[PDB]
């Protein structure tokens, strides 16, 4: 597998707040066209080759800052990441996810060529938290070459997701008032294929806002997710499968083995 960055992990390495590799940024005016600019964090290193991209969307009313945290946690992992805003902060979940799919025809098309020059630009992926999520979800409808989907306690009016074929983990918060995981995060995953790569991890007592704060649990496997279907690598598959079972996780499903 060429597409292997970095030395093999360990639990405690995709624990780690800081990857092994060195991060920049390149800041994306709100002038783009199609969505509302953002931050692009990229690995600084190049020596081990060019790196897939994923883009990540806030939620209903909050902006790119409430996705901050992923940008540099993520990235030095060996990703390049997109930390977006929307076109207003009132767009719906499919908007979000045309503006998901925008961002990264940006880093493709247009970006700086210290990002562009970094990037493979056939593997790539979506993230959004809240509406965001749900806009994860809509982008792999519209685009099925996506690598891979992380609906982060998504938000959508939408149930029905059977049409999805692109690798899909889904997080949701035990406690989550604003979308409660028994009437988005659960119905989403359900409705996904059964021979869909799948996941679903509910975190024990945590609200809509879990995934704006700094979260081991989450970050690890983010991590995990993207490296073993963005990266297609397997040194990672056995964090995702069989189902974790972190004192921090309430559930967790999957159709692994993967
Ligand atoms: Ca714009
Ligand atoms: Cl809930």
Not at 12 to 25: K, N, Q, W, Y
Not at 152 to 172: A, R, S
Not at 177 to 195: D, G, M, N, W
Request: with cysteine.
């Amino acid at each position: 597998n060429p597409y292997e960055r970095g030395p093999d992990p360990t639990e405690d390495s995709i624990e780690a707040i800081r990857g092994p590799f060195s991060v920049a940024t390149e800041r994306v005016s709100s002038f783009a066209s199609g969505f509302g600019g953002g931050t692009i964090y990229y690995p600084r290193e190049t020596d081990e080759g060019t790196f897939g991209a994923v883009a990540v969307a806030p939620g209903f009313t909050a902006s790119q800052g409430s996705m901050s945290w992923y940008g540099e946690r993520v990235a030095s992992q060996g990703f390049i990441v997109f930390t977006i805003d929307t076109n207003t902060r009132l767009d719906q979940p499919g908007q979000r996810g045309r503006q998901l799919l925008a961002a990264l025809d940006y880093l493709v098309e247009r970006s700086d060529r210290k990002v562009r020059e970094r990037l493979d630009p056939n593997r790539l992926a979506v993230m959004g938290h809240s509406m965001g999520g749900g806009g994860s979800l809509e982008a792999t409808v519209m685009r099925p070459s996506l690598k891979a989907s992380i609906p982060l306690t998504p938000w959508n009016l939408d149930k029905t997701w059977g049409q999805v074929q692109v690798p899909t983990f889904i997080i949701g918060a035990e406690l989550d008032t604003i979308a409660p995981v028994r009437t988005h995060a659960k119905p989403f995953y359900e409705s996904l294929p059964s021979s869909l790569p799948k996941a679903y991890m509910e975190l024990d007592g945590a609200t809509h806002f879990a995934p704006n704060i700094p979260n081991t649990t989450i970050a690890k496997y983010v991590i995990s997710w993207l490296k073993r279907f963005v990266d297609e690598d397997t040194r990672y598959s056995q964090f995702l499968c069989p189902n974790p079972t972190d004192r921090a996780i309430e559930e967790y499903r999957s159709t692994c083995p993967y």
